Amino acid sequence: QTLFEQLNSKNVNDHTEQKNGLTYLAWSYAHQELKKIDPNYTVKVHEFPHPDINTENYFVPYLATPEGYFVQVSVTVKDSTETEWLPVLDFRNKSLAKGSATTFDINKAQKRCFVKASALHGLGLYIYNGEELPSASDNDITELEERINQFVNLSQEKGRDATIDKTMRWLKISNINKLSQKQIAEAHQKLDAGLKQLDS
Amino acid sequence: QTLFEQLNSKNVNDHTEQKNGLTYLAWSYAHQELKKIDPNYTVKVHEFPHPDINTENYFVPYLATPEGYFVQVSVTVKDSTETEWLPVLDFRNKSLAKGSATTFDINKAQKRCFVKASALHGLGLYIY
Amino acid sequence: QTLFEQLNSKNVNDHTEQKNGLTYLAWSYAHQELKKIDPNYTVKVHEFPHPDINTENYFVPYLATPEGYFVQVSVTVKDSTETEWLPVLDFRNKSLAKGSATTFDINKAQKRCFVKASALHGLGLYIY
Amino acid sequence: QTLFEQLNSKNVNDHTEQKNGLTYLAWSYAHQELKKIDPNYTVKVHEFPHPDINTENYFVPYLATPEGYFVQVSVTVKDSTETEWLPVLDFRNKSLAKGSATTFDINKAQKRCFVKASALHGLGLYIYNGEELPSASDNDITELEERINQFVNLSQEKGRDATIDKTMRWLKISNINKLSQKQIAEAHQKLDAGLKQLDS
Amino acid sequence: QTLFEQLNSKNVNDHTEQKNGLTYLAWSYAHQELKKIDPNYTVKVHEFPHPDINTENYFVPYLATPEGYFVQVSVTVKDSTETEWLPVLDFRNKSLAKGSATTFDINKAQKRCFVKASALHGLGLYIY
């Protein structure tokens, strides 16, 4: 057959850890599988001149930016080669600003970028299927906007006048972005009662 | 036939996520199709000297500007090659001014620019 | 016939969006048609040294000026090649002064300049 | 067969030390096993120009960064070669900031990175079993977050307003991230008192 | 057989000192054993430009760092060659900060790194 199909058709579900509600496959499992497929394969962690230090011949193994921190890993399995970028994140999967990261945070990110680079080849690609690309955790923020506009538009459709800002005041929400899933679910409850009852 | 028509005539609707009311195909589906069609294909994320740092030999993987942030991805499927530009945004379609972005936002934008670059080839163009 | 006539005699009316009272053809449609007429065609977004930063080897993908912002796109369909300039504009079609633009504004302008560059070839010229 | 399978199929469990609840195989054992497999093999510790000093021809054996400290070890067993990144950590497995490390910390890190580099080859591959992905200490500290949120929510369910920062003020913890394990137990005692009697 | 197995299968327990509850084999014994195995071997103590002094052509025999002090020893027994890193420690096995070490501390560290470098070869690995 081919490397991607062979590697893609494997179950890496047994060797996974559920931390923060995400699925992670161990690097050691990944190291073994590839080693079996190819006895001689290369893993290279890119090194980039660190900005603040700016010392000649000095190349730390990770990007350092005011915006944050980046890592890069290039896995060459057989002839095929490929690379992956990753964001350094807290144990709560939150970003780390310049000067708040620890070496331990960088090594964990380096190991995670390795399995992600392996995921490019068929092995365990389904581990990142539909979770890595989009914002899986929250999709009601916009839904809330549609439902407040439905309220406003229905209110105008009925009579008098209706405005989104006064509707937001019902929810008493300072910022739509700054709204907890728990509060937004409570918000839906407020709106559905105003709109659904007059619909049903 | 041809690569565009073959790739264009596929249904990527099943593997889509509705976030902010927009339809997105997961990079995993795009990556697997590119591998099947072509076993050896290249994805390259362009690196540009970051402005503020201005350190010699210092190349971050994304554009940093007072106006905002840009990413670039070049996908070479078979002989054909192509590139896509993307802004770095919030989870919602909102811009990130200079100094308000996180490394995670840049990563998500990089992955999204990949599927968009794949969308240039026939696969899932109707979504994008 | 001729490439301009072959592309000029098409109806892109169905794939259009009426925003602000103007008619726009989506890039998805424009990009696919260029592939349909030519499997291998090139789209290049010009990069110009950003003024304020003035960092060596630093090239942003759009012009930055005190007067405002400019983008450029060069579409090579078959042998024919051509380029289009456009001003980056707000969602109300108003100008953006230096330091008031967001990366998202630039990417939207880049996509719009693409279809306008395609409009130079026969496809959808009547709209633009 | 092949080097990875032969090396992978070994029991290094007997020669291990349980410190901090993690499993480590001693370098002495790793040095002999490889030596048997290959009489002539090379271990190289990379040297990088130290930033602050910035003296010409001055190369320390470890990375020094404001973010922290990094070490690198390249083990060439037979034809195969490979490299490992390890973050210098306290005896409590915590990060060390720039200017808080001691040469002893670096040498211990260097030895540990060696066995991890050996682990890339089949020997010692399973001992970690992705030991990096589960910290095994953050989850305990994370439970405190679940229990303070339980106290905030159940308080808000009682109808008495509670905020996480004021609930944290009960524990008087400056950084919920860094708290001694005895203090986590002491904090749990505070929370479980005010929370369990309602739960019951 | 082979050098590691021959050297590994020896009892260096008799020539050891119990200081601080640790076991150390004296260098004198290590120098003789290797000399017997190989009449012509080499011991090299690496020299690194000392930071603070920063005098041209000035090379001290040990690393000096704000974090602390490092030594290096490379033992070439027969064809085989190898190197060891030892951190300078107090008589209580505690670290010495920059400016608190004495030349005596460095020489003791250098001798100890030698036996550890010898320990890489089969001789007395069980102790180290």
- Nearest CA-CA partner of B106 in A95, A90, C105: A95
Q: For the purposes of burial, counting CB atoms within 10 Å of the CB of D92, is it exposed (0-12), middle (13-18) or buried (19 or more)?
A: exposed
A36/C36 Cα distance (integer angstroms):
44
Nearest CA-CA distance, residue E64 and chain D, Å: 9
Residue B72 has which token pair? 């670039």
Helix (H) or strand (E) holding D182: helix D181-199
C92/A184 Cα distance (integer angstroms):
30
Residues 6+ apart with CB under 8 A from D156: D162
Q: Answer whether B69's CB lies under 8 Å from B106's CB.
A: yes
Do C and B have ≥3 inter-chain CB pairs under 8 A? yes
Distance of CA B125 to the CA centre of its chain: 13
Whether residue C32 lies within 8 A of chain B, CB to CB, comes out as yes
CA angle D130, D135, D138 (to 5 degrees): 155
Task: Tell me which chain D residue has its CA closest to the CA of residue E50.
Answer: D58
Residue D161 has which token pair? 């307003």
CB-CB neighbours of A137 under 10 Å: 11
What torsion do the CA atoms of B1, B4, B6, B10 make, to the nearest 10 degrees?
A: -160
Best probe of the B interface among A65, A90, A116, by most B CBs < 10 A, is A65
Nearest CA-CA distance, residue E24 and chain D, Å: 15
Residue D137 has which token pair? 């200490």
Please tell me the number of Cα atoms within 13 Å of D34 on its side-chain side. 28
CA atoms A72, A129, B102, A93: torsion sign: negative
Q: What are the beta bridge partners of residue D83?
A: D74
C60/B70 Cα distance (integer angstroms):
9
CA angle E33, E35, E38 (to 5 degrees): 110
CB-CB neighbours of B51 under 10 Å: 19
- Nearest CA-CA partner of B114 in B47, B43, B64, B59: B43
Residue A151 has which token pair? 């309220």
Decide: helix, strand or coil at residue E93.
Answer: coil
Q: Answer whether E34's CB lies under 8 Å from E118's CB.
A: yes
Residue that has been written with the tokens 């992905």 in this structure:
D133
Whether residue D58 lies within 8 A of chain E, CB to CB, comes out as yes
Whether residue B39 lies within 8 A of chain A, CB to CB, comes out as yes
E101/D199 Cα distance (integer angstroms):
60
DSSP symbol at A126 = G
Distance of CA E101 to the CA centre of its chain: 17
Which residue stretches of chain A are H helix? Answer: 3-8, 27-37, 103-120, 140-158, 164-171, 181-199
Distance of CA D4 to the CA centre of its chain: 25
Whether residue A22 lies within 8 A of chain D, CB to CB, comes out as no
Q: What are the beta bridge partners of residue C16?
A: C25
Report how far apart, in Å, the C-alpha atoms of B56 and of each of A56, B63, C60 are.
Answer: 9, 16, 18
For chain A, which chains pass the contact test of at least 3 CB pairs under 8 Å? B, D
CB-CB neighbours of C18 under 10 Å: 8
DSSP symbol at B16 = E
Give the method of determination. cryo-EM
DSSP symbol at E86 = E
Phi then psi for E25, rounded to 5 degrees?
Answer: -90, 135
Whether residue C39 lies within 8 A of chain B, CB to CB, comes out as yes
**How does E59-69 read in b/e, with b if 16+ C-beta sit within 10 Å?**
eeebbbbbbbb
Q: What are the beta bridge partners of residue E78?
A: none
A67/B71 Cα distance (integer angstroms):
14
Which residue stretches of D100-179 are H helix? Answer: 103-120, 125-128, 138-158, 164-171
Overall resolution, Å: 3.9
C69/C109 Cα distance (integer angstroms):
10
Instruction: Classify B32 in phi/psi space as left (phi over 0), alpha (psi -120 to 50) or beta.
Output: alpha
E122/D179 Cα distance (integer angstroms):
45
For chain D, which chains pass the contact test of at least 3 CB pairs under 8 Å? A, E
DSSP symbol at C56 = T
Nearest CA-CA distance, residue D189 and chain A, Å: 24
Which residue stretches of E20-102 are H helix? Answer: 27-37
Whether residue B116 lies within 8 A of chain A, CB to CB, comes out as no
Residues 6+ apart with CB under 8 A from D13: D127
Give E-chain residues touching D36 at CB under 8 angstroms.
Answer: 2, 4-5
B74/B97 Cα distance (integer angstroms):
25
Among candidates A68, A136, A177 on the partner chain, residue whose Cβ is nearest the Cβ of B103 = A68
Residue A170 has which token pair? 């019902």
B119/B84 Cα distance (integer angstroms):
10
Q: Answer whether A62's CB lies under 8 Å from A46's CB.
A: no
Residue D34 has which token pair? 């490889």
Q: For the purposes of burial, counting CB atoms within 10 Å of the CB of D47, is it exposed (0-12), middle (13-18) or buried (19 or more)?
A: middle
Contact D96 A106 (CB under 8 A): no
Contact A130 B28 (CB under 8 A): yes
- Nearest CA-CA partner of B127 in B5, B6, B18: B18
Distance of CA E94 to the CA centre of its chain: 17
Rg (CA), chain E: 16
Task: Tell me which chain B residue has its CA closest to the CA of residue C40.
Answer: B80
Helix pair E103-120, E27-37: axis angle to 10 deg: 40
- Nearest CA-CA partner of E42 in E73, E72, E75: E75
Residues 6+ apart with CB under 8 A from D172: none
Q: Answer whether B106's CB lies under 8 Å from B88's CB.
A: yes
Give C-chain residues touching B126 at CB under 8 angstroms.
Answer: 28
Task: Tell me which chain B residue has its CA closest to the CA of residue A146.
Answer: B21
Single-letter amino acid code for the residue at D81 = T
Which residue stretches of B23-102 are H helix? Answer: 27-37
Whether residue A48 lies within 8 A of chain B, CB to CB, comes out as yes
CB-CB neighbours of D158 under 10 Å: 10
Among candidates E2, E69, E80 on the partner chain, residue whose Cβ is nearest the Cβ of D103 = E69
Give D-chain residues touching E5 at CB under 8 angstroms.
Answer: 36
Contact B66 C99 (CB under 8 A): yes
Single-letter amino acid code for the residue at B12 = V
Q: Answer whether A58's CB lies under 8 Å from D51's CB.
A: yes
Residue that has been written with the tokens 């394990």 in this structure:
D181
Residue A194 has which token pair? 């105003």
- Nearest CA-CA partner of D124 in D1, D6, D7: D7
Q: Answer whether C73's CB lies under 8 Å from C117's CB.
A: yes
Give A-chain residues touching D126 at CB under 8 angstroms.
Answer: 28
Q: Answer whether C71's CB lies under 8 Å from C100's CB.
A: no
Residues 6+ apart with CB under 8 A from B117: B43, B73, B74, B75, B82, B83, B84
Nearest CA-CA distance, residue D124 and chain E, Å: 19
D12/C128 Cα distance (integer angstroms):
73
